[PDB]
Amino acid sequence: MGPVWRKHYITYRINNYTPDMNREDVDYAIRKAFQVWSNVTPLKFSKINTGMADILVVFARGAHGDDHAFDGKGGILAHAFGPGSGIGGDAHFDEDEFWTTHSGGTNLFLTAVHEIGHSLGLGHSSDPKAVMFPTYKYVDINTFRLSADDIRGIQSLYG
Numbered sequence: 001m002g003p004v005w006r007k008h009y010i011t012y013r014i015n016n017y018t019p020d021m022n023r024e025d026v027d028y029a030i031r032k033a034f035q036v037w038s039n040v041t042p043l044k045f046s047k048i049n050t051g052m053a054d055i056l057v058v059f060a061r062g063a064h065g066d067d068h069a070f071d072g073k074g075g076i077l078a079h080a081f082g083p084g085s086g087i088g089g090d091a092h093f094d095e096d097e098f099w100t101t102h103s104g105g106t107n108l109f110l111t112a113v114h115e116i117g118h119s120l121g122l123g124h125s126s127d128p129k130a131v132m133f134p135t136y137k138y139v140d141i142n143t144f145r146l147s148a149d150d151i152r153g154i155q156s157l158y159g
């Protein structure tokens with residue numbers, strides 16, 4: 001198994017906020033994306049407003065200080081680093097995308113579910129129903145569920 005957090009209590013902090021969205025919608029989207037993974041694991045996520053967090057959430061564009069430059073509108077929407085110190089765990093969202101609460105532009109909640117999967121140690125799935133499938137697909141966020149493969153993958157890492 002690839003890297004995993006060696007603790008079940010994991011902190012996050014939002015570094016900065018996309019102008020594309022209301023601030024409170026960003027907080028809600030991120031909180032609900034952590035909750036999707038909380039619901040199927042023993043992991044507990046604590047938001048910190050200031051100071052050291054395991055998972056830093058960043059919106060940035062182009063070359064943004066890691067060795068993994070973003071590519072402008074479309075192509076790569078986001079990435080995340082597997083568990084570890086420093087940049088380990090951190091999830092980055094390409095600000096050249098138009099982040100939304102809905103089916104237009106790029107739905108932040110769905111993208112954050114995928115990226116936090118990476119932040120917890122998952123790779124891609126070959127199952128197109130899996131949130132960890134490599135490509136973005138809008139699905140009704142009211143009806144959203146992790147596939148059986150996403151649950152198998154995260155439970156093989158934690159519990």
Ligand SMILES: O=C(Cn1cccc(O)c1=O)NCCc1c[nH]c2ccccc12
Pocket residue numbers: 074075076077078079110111112114130131132133134135136137
């Ligand atoms: O950034 C990407 C990969 N990607 C590359 C070129 C064109 C794309 O449309 C695209 O999704 N993947 C991370 C976001 C993602 C990957 N799988 C998902 C499933 C649901 C929601 C979001 C995602």
Ligand SMILES: [Ca+2]
Pocket residue numbers: 053054055056084085086087088089090
């Ligand atoms: Ca980190």
Ligand SMILES: [Ca+2]
Pocket residue numbers: 070071072073074075076077094096097
């Ligand atoms: Ca991009």
Ligand SMILES: [Ca+2]
Pocket residue numbers: 018019020094095096097098099
């Ligand atoms: Ca944007």
Ligand SMILES: [Zn+2]
Pocket residue numbers: 064066068079092
């Ligand atoms: Zn990055």
Ligand SMILES: [Zn+2]
Pocket residue numbers: 114118124134
């Ligand atoms: Zn991915």
